[PDB]
DNA sequence: CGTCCAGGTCTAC
DNA sequence: GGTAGACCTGGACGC
């Protein structure tokens, strides 16, 4: 009871609650669906991971999101700590209101939304998001998830151990820019993305003026932010859109991968009309992103997250 | 066991 | 501009 990952049943006094209906949040549809790669369902309905530099376990009942933290004596999370959870889930954004809107303007969205409630966007750290999505390219979620864990294990600071799992914070730019990072990441199975991690960490610190440059894209425009990210090695349109949506507070950013292509054709009979290219291409991928913005409006990326997630499950 | 595929990015024509 | 091929890996899918 004192050791291992906590459950709600087994250590009741160490949990605290955040009011939040399952209609506003389904952990099981958000945490393994390729937004963040850093959460594991270590016991049934309990998700463990690192969030604002500490380890947490999260579980839900119909009206509550229950939260425990591992930091000192074992105790309930504090009000300030609980805030970090609220911010990470962006719980001020009311998902019932967005679903209504998207539902009204798109009857296909209405149909999928009935069976896939509580899919919202996490608000992620820019560095973690940048380097996770560099690992995402031409890859599947199961393998990306391992790549990311091994990366944090080798280069990130040791937080705490539960059972046989040692949690690590996400690596700094400095660690990722270090000597022989590529060769090390190649032995950890990252393949060609090993080079991209080293190169982007160095590009940021040595050519772009460091962490500040990345962080300040939050206050910049989607279009400025998206252009700025594309200069980095391993960061194309898609990876940049993932970062803008998931880390830089750009809700209108819509990543366009093979899933979204399939969704467009199957469920909207979409075809490009500004370019003569039949398939995925820079100009057809731009157009498809514009189609979804025009359809769903300024939170189109959030709508994308609902159908993307629902397409993973089918 | 050989292709094909997964939250693509690159350069080269 | 739209197009093709190279780059890691390891599960799923046939033949
Ligand atoms: C998909 C292969 O290209 C990845 C980005 O270019 C190489 C720099 S690390
Ligand atoms: Mg606690
Ligand atoms: Mg780039």
Author numbering: 9 to 79, 83 to 325
Article passage:
On the basis of this screen, we have selected the Y207C variant, because it crosslinks efficiently but is substantially distant from the active site of the enzyme to participate in the catalysis and does not interact with DNA in native LRC, and crosslinked it through the X8 linker to the minor groove N2-exocyclic amine of 3′ guanine of the target nucleobase. In parallel, we solved the structure of the control complex (2.37 Å resolution) to show that DXL between Y207C and the X8 linker does not interfere with oxoG extrusion and recognition by hOGG1. The structure of this complex, herein xLRC (with catalytically inactive K249Q), reveals that the active site as well as the overall structure is identical within an RMSD of 0.201 Å for Cα atoms (a total of 2058 atoms) to those of the native LRC16. In the xLRC structure the oxoG is extrahelical and deeply inserted into the enzyme’s lesion recognition pocket as observed in the native LRC complex, confirming that the introduced mutations and crosslinking through the X8 linker do not interfere with the extrusion of oxoG into the active site of hOGG1. Secondly, in the LRC, F319 and C253 interact with both π-faces of the extruded oxoG, which sandwich the base in the active site of hOGG1. The extruded oxoG is further stabilized by hydrogen bonding with the sidechain carbonyl of Q315 and also with the backbone carbonyl of G42. In LRC16, Y203 wedges into the DNA helical stack on the 5′-side of the estranged C stabilizing a helical bend. N149 enters the space left vacant by the oxoG extrusion and hydrogen bonds with the Watson-Crick face of the estranged C. In addition, the estranged C is stabilized by R154 and R204 that form bidentate hydrogen bonds together with N149.
Most forms of damage to the heterocyclic nucleobases of DNA are repaired by mechanistically related pathways collectively referred to as the base-excision repair (BER) mechanism. Both the recognition of damaged sites and initiation of repair by BER are performed by DNA glycosylases, lesion-specific enzymes that recognize specific nucleobase damages in the genome and catalyze their excision through cleavage of the glycosidic bond. Among them, 8-oxoguanine (oxoG, OG) presents the greatest challenge to the DNA glycosylases responsible for its repair, due to its unique combination of structural innocuousness, extrordinary mutagenicity, and chronic low-level production. The question addressed here is whether the 8-oxoguanine DNA glycosylase responsible for oxoG recognition and repair in humans, namely hOGG1, interrogates DNA in the same way as the functionally equivalent bacterial enzyme MutM, despite the lack of an overall structural and sequence similarity between these two oxoG repair enzymes. In summary, we present X-ray crystallographic structures of human DNA glycosylase hOGG1 interrogating DNA lesions in their intrahelical position, achieved by covalent trapping of an ordinarily transient state in DNA recognition.
